[PDB]
């Protein structure tokens, strides 16, 4: 029987997902104009166009964040990775939700992620590249952050600050976690043998 642990203990899927999330985050930041367009250069990934920042500290921040996400994926401790767009008052305006499920057993009847990784992931990238045509216009001056929704059961005897790979993370507060009954915009869903992933956007109502 083929199991998730058979693919290098979850490291393959964690490495593929962090590669993907880096590119997807960059593209979100471009199309939503979180940063000036001049920092992004055109590249290819998954044989499709992508737009990637050349700003060193932005780049390193995104890599550092994903460095912390990688072990959480390897231990199967991630339900969602969310790119949260915050307005100038620091309130969430929009959320790009990457909903990730890694079952312990491979799904038999589903497409092979590893034989078809470019085509499968490209689909998500192409949707992001044109999403501005289905979303509302963000107010000026938005910023972003990244929320990781884990599988760990919460337990009220808990320290807000959690250090991962020497970077301090925090339990996310009401100011970010809460959107007032948002509108859900589906972008893309995939079910493959190893990985189920859904991308959708939450927009403030």
């Amino acid at each position: 029987t083929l199991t998730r642990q058979d693919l290098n203990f979850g490291q393959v899927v964690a490495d593929v997902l962090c590669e993907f999330l880096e590119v997807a985050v960059h593209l979100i930041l471009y199309v939503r104009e979180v940063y000036p367009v001049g920092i992004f250069q055109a590249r290819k990934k998954y044989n499709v166009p992508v737009q990637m920042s050349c700003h060193p500290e932005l780049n390193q921040y995104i890599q550092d964040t994903l460095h912390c996400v990688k072990p959480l994926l390897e231990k199967n401790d991630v339900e969602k990775v969310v790119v949260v767009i915050l307005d100038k008052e620091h309130r969430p305006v929009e959320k790009f939700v990457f909903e990730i499920t890694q079952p312990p057993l491979l799904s038999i009847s589903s497409d092979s992620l590893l034989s078809h990784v470019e085509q499968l992931l490209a689909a998500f990238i192409l949707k992001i590249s044109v999403c501005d045509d289905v979303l509302d216009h963000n107010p000026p001056g938005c910023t972003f952050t990244v929320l990781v929704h884990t599988r760990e059961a919460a337990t009220r005897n808990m320290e807000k600050i959690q250090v991962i790979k020497d970077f301090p993370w925090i339990l996310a507060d009401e100011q970010d976690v809460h959107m007032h009954d948002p509108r859900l915009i589906p972008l893309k869903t995939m079910t493959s043998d190893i990985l189920k992933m859904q991308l959708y956007v939450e927009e403030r109502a």
Partner: peptide, 25 residues
Amino acid sequence: DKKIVIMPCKCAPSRQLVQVWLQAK
């Protein structure tokens, strides 16, 4: 039954920081 949701304590570089870098060349 709630799960732990976490975010970085530190912000990404601000838009203005990046604007200064770009304009500088």
